[PDB]
Ligand binder design. Structure first.
Ligand SMILES: O=C(O)c1cccc(-c2ccc(C(=O)O)o2)c1
Length: 438
């Protein structure tokens, strides 16, 4: 099905070649794109053939300057799903992002959103370039894209420049104070856990593809992305899989809970791993989160199909390590891939426990709308597939402002100073790897 298949050159890693190709194609064609890494394939979705924009109050489908603009009601997953299924009648895959705000409708909180709040942006690409350890496959590539790959193979990948440091120690948004307020709300019995966050400004412009390459070779995320889409530049090393739906009907979700530092050498990392695996506080939070995922997944699964296939094992994520479980079910004939995403979104590590009360608290105690942060980056296929990675450990550039964003799960025993240090550990997935724009 690919019109070209080129063997991967010796000594070149696919993440490096795919991100370099995104830079070369940017220079020659100047188009929007989304690069998504999923199970050893880096798929560069290049150019926008058609775009679906789901907002809180409207749905727009834009193709070649022509817009279908429609009011929508009911579930946001049905509005997005109907438009995306339409894109996939004539193309194999669609890609994009879903905001954290897409998940508030299931809890009846959508009236709290401001008008015109973005919920999702999903596009069908003009071209797809798939890069694996074995080969480069070209789908619907015109002469400029074919010549860009030829030029890159002739020159080889660029050497990544040295990175530039950033200060994460300032607290202009009062994260420590906001954690103290959440702790008091938890002590009052309003909820059990809430995830709060803070932004850190990057006071210099970064090169997104070079920063992506440098951070990727020091991280082991479950998925990753690099994009330039409708005025947003973003990259991330997604630590958690929100949902994967396969064409054969198998649904997977991989919740994480608990955090210890990682990357401090073998001896310190082993002590942190043994503490994480045996700490009552982390075990209880992980068990509650697995029980929550199983309750959610039963609403969309064939009866008796839900199962935990890997339980409470350490998942290494670069600057941090977490407890994780892999939950599997079979999609019920009465359900669909968007209803599976809606059942599992937002993740507990994006919201809290109970999830409804965590989302309500975020509207008051966090900077809203969150947008891409704690939402998902997605890949959908014409055969029914869906892959949705949780957007944490990401960097953004919008309108000349570059920033990072990290948070923490706050419970009754949380201390503001420790939670602030925890956001610093999560920021460390990116802060040593920022390449300035040259
Ligand atoms: O609540 C937990 O146990 C838990 C576990 C792993 C991650 C997170 C979490 C919340 C926000 C971020 C981030 O901005 O990266 O990460 C929370």
């Amino acid at each position: 099905t690919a019109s070209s298949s080129i063997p991967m050159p010796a000594g070149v890693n696919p993440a490096d070649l795919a991100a370099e190709l995104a830079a070369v194609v940017t220079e020659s064609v100047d188009e929007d794109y989304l690069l998504y890494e999923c199970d050893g394939q880096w798929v560069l979705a290049a150019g926008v053939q058609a775009m679906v924009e789901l907002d809180s109050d409207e749905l727009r489908v834009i193709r070649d300057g022509v817009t279908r603009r429609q009011q929508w009601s009911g579930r946001p997953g049905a509005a997005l799903g109907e438009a995306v299924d339409r894109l996939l009648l004539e193309t194999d895959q669609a890609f994009g992002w879903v905001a954290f705000e897409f998940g508030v409708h299931r809890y009846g909180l959508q009236q709290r959103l401001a008008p015109h709040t973005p919920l999702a942006r999903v596009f069908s690409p003009r071209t797809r370039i798939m890069v694996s350890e074995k080969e480069i496959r070209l789908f619907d590539a015109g002469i400029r894209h074919r010549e860009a790959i030829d030029r890159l193979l002739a020159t080889g990948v660029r050497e990544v420049p040295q990175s530039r440091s950033v200060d994460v120690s300032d607290d202009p948004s009062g994260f420590r104070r906001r954690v103290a307020v959440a702790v008091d709300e938890i002590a009052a019995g309003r909820y059990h856990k809430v995830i709060l966050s803070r932004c850190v400004e990057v006071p210099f412009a970064i090169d997104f593809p070079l920063t992506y390459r440098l951070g990727r070779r020091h991280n082991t995320p479950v998925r990753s992305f690099l994009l330039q889409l409708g005025g947003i530049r973003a990259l991330g090393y997604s630590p958690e899989l929100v949902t994967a739906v396969r064409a054969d009907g198998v649904v997977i979700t991989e919740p994480l809970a608990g955090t210890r530092a990682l990357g401090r050498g073998p001896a310190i990392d082993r002590l942190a791993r043994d503490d994480l695996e045996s700490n009552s506080k982390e075990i209880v939070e992980h068990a509650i989160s697995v029980r929550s995922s199983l309750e959610e997944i039963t609403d969309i699964a064939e009866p008796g199909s839900a199962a935990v296939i890997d339980f409470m094992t350490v998942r290494e994520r670069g600057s941090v390590q977490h407890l994780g479980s892999t939950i599997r079910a079979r999609l019920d004939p009465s359900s669909d891939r968007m209803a599976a995403l809606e059942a599992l979104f937002p993740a507990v590590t994006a919201s809290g426990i109970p999830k409804a009360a965590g989302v309500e608290a975020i509207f008051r105690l966090d900077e809203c709308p969150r947008g891409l942060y704690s939402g998902a980056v997605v890949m959908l296929s014409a055969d029914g597939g869906l892959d949705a990675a949780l957007t944490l450990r990401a960097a953004y550039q919008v309108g000349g402002r570059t920033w990072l964003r990290a948070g923490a799960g706050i419970i009754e025993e949380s201390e503001p100073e420790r939670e602030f240090e925890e956001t610093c550990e999560k920021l460390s997935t990116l802060t040593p790897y920022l390449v300035a724009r040259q």
